[PDB]
Design a protein around this ligand. Structure first.
Ligand SMILES: CCCCCCCCCCC(CCCCCCCCCC)(CO[C@H]1O[C@@H](CO)[C@H](O[C@@H]2O[C@@H](CO)[C@H](O)[C@@H](O)[C@@H]2O)[C@@H](O)[C@@H]1O)CO[C@H]1O[C@@H](CO)[C@H](O[C@@H]2O[C@@H](CO)[C@H](O)[C@@H](O)[C@@H]2O)[C@@H](O)[C@H]1O
Ligand SMILES: CCCCCCCCCCCCCCCCCC(=O)OC[C@H](COP(=O)(O)OCCN)OC(=O)CCCCCCCCCCCCCCCCC
Lengths: 50, 85, 48, 82, 106, 90
């Protein structure tokens, strides 16, 4: 989500009554880092290539 | 430390736009001067102005308010709302 | 009298503020629990 | 989250250091240096490999070799004298 | 998809912001930057005479993908802004009175 | 003509005490999320994913630990040691 929209929770990017997902805590702010530049499959190829 | 004022923002944006070359005149610039109509800027020149505004102040802005700052007084009243300098 | 003390302590002798007003448990936890619980350490050290 | 990353990276090697130390106190019986270094030339290679594999994964975690290294650069959310 | 209007203007101004930003973080040596920015400017000035919707949409999503190729690993963020390193160091705590839960103490 | 007696005077039940003010605003989404997660077992069903996880962690993984634990039973005797000596028993 972008940070510039003014949520209730700027810390976690979440409006006050917003429906949480099936299996939320993989999609939390406290969830893993989840990079967005490479595709994960490509990234696997480049790491094993080096 | 270093704390900005309103007149500091004023003189920085006036000396900013006096450096730019596709303005109409260096004499018709006011706090209330429209960038699009009074200064004779395009749809796309005003975006490069906004880009220089945000580079020179430090602060970065989204596109949600990048069109909001149509006149110069709106740019000054924008930038004096942010505690970053 | 218990309710008239503690309700007035919550909303507002009442109108003072000094610390710390001794509670109900501190007489037999500092003077029976804690010294027997220190004596237990002493006996465990010297029984070793 | 960088503190999470850093300490859980170090804890990965702390597990293998505990494994290695449980091997230490059964091969040599002792945790002191003065007995282990006196008797280390008698135990054969098939055991010291098992020891120093554990005590090298322990160092590979904290002295930041390639197997896990992404807690150093993820420790710059602390300040500069840290 | 549509000619001269606000819905096309907001799009192309957003894409022009992104096309200057995604070369700001990309090189050092400001001389080369302001050169490159003038020719990026010339690319937007040269093709802005399209009179049909279809070839407009064709060049439009083609340059959306061209801008999508040259993405950068970390964009230059000012530190007090939410990609940066000064972001939320000491947020001042909100002024709040103590909400009490126990009748008895405290 | 069968009524419990006129000699009862039964009243209402209080739990007694102090109305503590609300220190928490409950979020309806988080509340129904958590009520869905704790009582998850009343709506669980067998699918291919559920069966795959149940095949691994209940059957295959105890059997693998069983093979490793009952085969390698009294092999290793790492008490003293020397060079060239037997490290195992079998
Ligand atoms: C051996 C493996 C052999 C393969 C068997 C897989 C198995 C047994 C797994 C039990 C394992 C026991 C665990 C204990 C292990 C002990 C060591 C589970 O089959 C599961 O496969 C899953 C993926 O295919 C399905 O997920 C979902 O799929 C979509 C909706 O089906 C959703 O849209 C999707 O969102 C989900 O992904 C499950 O619904 C399905 O039950 C049986 O498969 C078969 O069962 C039969 C009878 O029911 C089914 O008949 C039908 O079901 C109705 C649907 O209700 C139909 O309406 C109806 O026409 C018919 O009656 C078959 O269809 C088939 O399912
Ligand atoms: C062959 C030589 C062996 C030498 C080593 C080889 C490489 C091994 C590398 C993997 C081991 C690393 C240690 C595992 C712990 C990882 C902890 C961790 O990374 O947590 C970080 C994560 C948040 O970090 P992040 O979001 O990325 O921070 C960004 C800051 N800007 O914080 C989190 O929220 C993560 C919470 C989940 C933590 C991971 C849970 C899975 C752990 C896997 C352990 C596997 C155990 C399986 C046991 C099976 C035994 C039969």
């Amino acid at each position: 989500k972008n940070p510039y929209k003014k949520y209730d929770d700027q810390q976690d990017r979440r409006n006050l009554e917003e429906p949480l997902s099936v299996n939320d805590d993989l999609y939390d702010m406290w969830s893993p880092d989840r990079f967005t530049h490479f595709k994960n499959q490509d990234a696997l190829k480049y790491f094993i290539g080096f | 430390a270093h704390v900005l004022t309103k007149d500091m923002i004023q003189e920085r944006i006036v000396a900013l736009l006096e450096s730019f070359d596709k303005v109409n005149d260096a004499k018709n610039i006011t706090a209330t001067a429209n960038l699009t109509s009074d200064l004779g800027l395009d749809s796309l020149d005003v975006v490069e102005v906004v880009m220089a505004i945000e580079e020179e102040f430090g602060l970065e802005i989204p596109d949600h308010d990048a069109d909001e700052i149509k006149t110069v007084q709106q740019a000054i009243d924008y930038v004096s709302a942010q505690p970053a300098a | 009298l218990k309710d008239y003390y503690y309700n007035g302590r919550r909303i507002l002798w009442e109108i003072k503020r000094e610390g710390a007003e001794k509670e109900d448990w501190v007489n037999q936890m500092y003077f029976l629990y804690a010294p027997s619980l220190i004596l237990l350490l002493i006996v465990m050290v010297y029984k070793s | 989250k960088s503190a999470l990353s850093a300490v859980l990276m170090n804890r990965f090697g702390d597990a293998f250091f505990v494994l290695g130390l449980c091997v230490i106190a059964y091969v040599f019986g002792t945790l002191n240096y003065s007995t282990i270094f006196a008797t280390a030339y008698l135990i054969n290679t098939d055991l010291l490999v098992l020891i120093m594999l554990a005590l090298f994964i322990a160092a590979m975690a904290k002295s930041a070799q390639f197997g896990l290294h992404n807690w150093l650069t993820l420790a710059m959310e602390g300040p500069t004298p840290v | 998809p549509v000619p001269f209007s606000a819905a096309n203007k907001k799009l192309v101004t957003s894409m022009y912001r992104q096309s200057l930003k995604l070369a700001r973080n990309w090189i050092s040596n400001r001389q080369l930057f302001r050169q490159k920015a003038v020719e990026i400017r010339h690319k937007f000035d040269q093709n802005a005479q399209i009179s049909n919707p279809r070839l407009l949409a064709r060049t439009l999503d083609e340059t959306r993908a061209h801008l999508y190729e040259f993405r950068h690993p970390d964009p230059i963020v000012p530190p007090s802004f939410p990609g940066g390193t000064k972001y939320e160091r000491n947020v001042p705590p909100r002024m709040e009175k103590i909400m009490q839960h126990n009748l008895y103490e405290p | 003509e069968l009524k419990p007696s006129s000699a009862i005077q039964r009243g209402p039940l209080n739990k007694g005490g102090w109305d503590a003010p609300h220190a928490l605003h409950n979020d309806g989404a988080i509340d129904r999320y958590a009520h869905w997660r704790t009582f998850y077992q009343e709506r669980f069903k067998y699918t291919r994913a559920t069966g795959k996880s149940t095949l691994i962690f209940l059957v295959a993984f105890p059997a693998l630990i069983g093979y490793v634990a009952y085969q390698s039973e009294g092999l290793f005797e790492f008490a003293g040691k020397r060079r060239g000596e037997s490290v195992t028993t079998r």
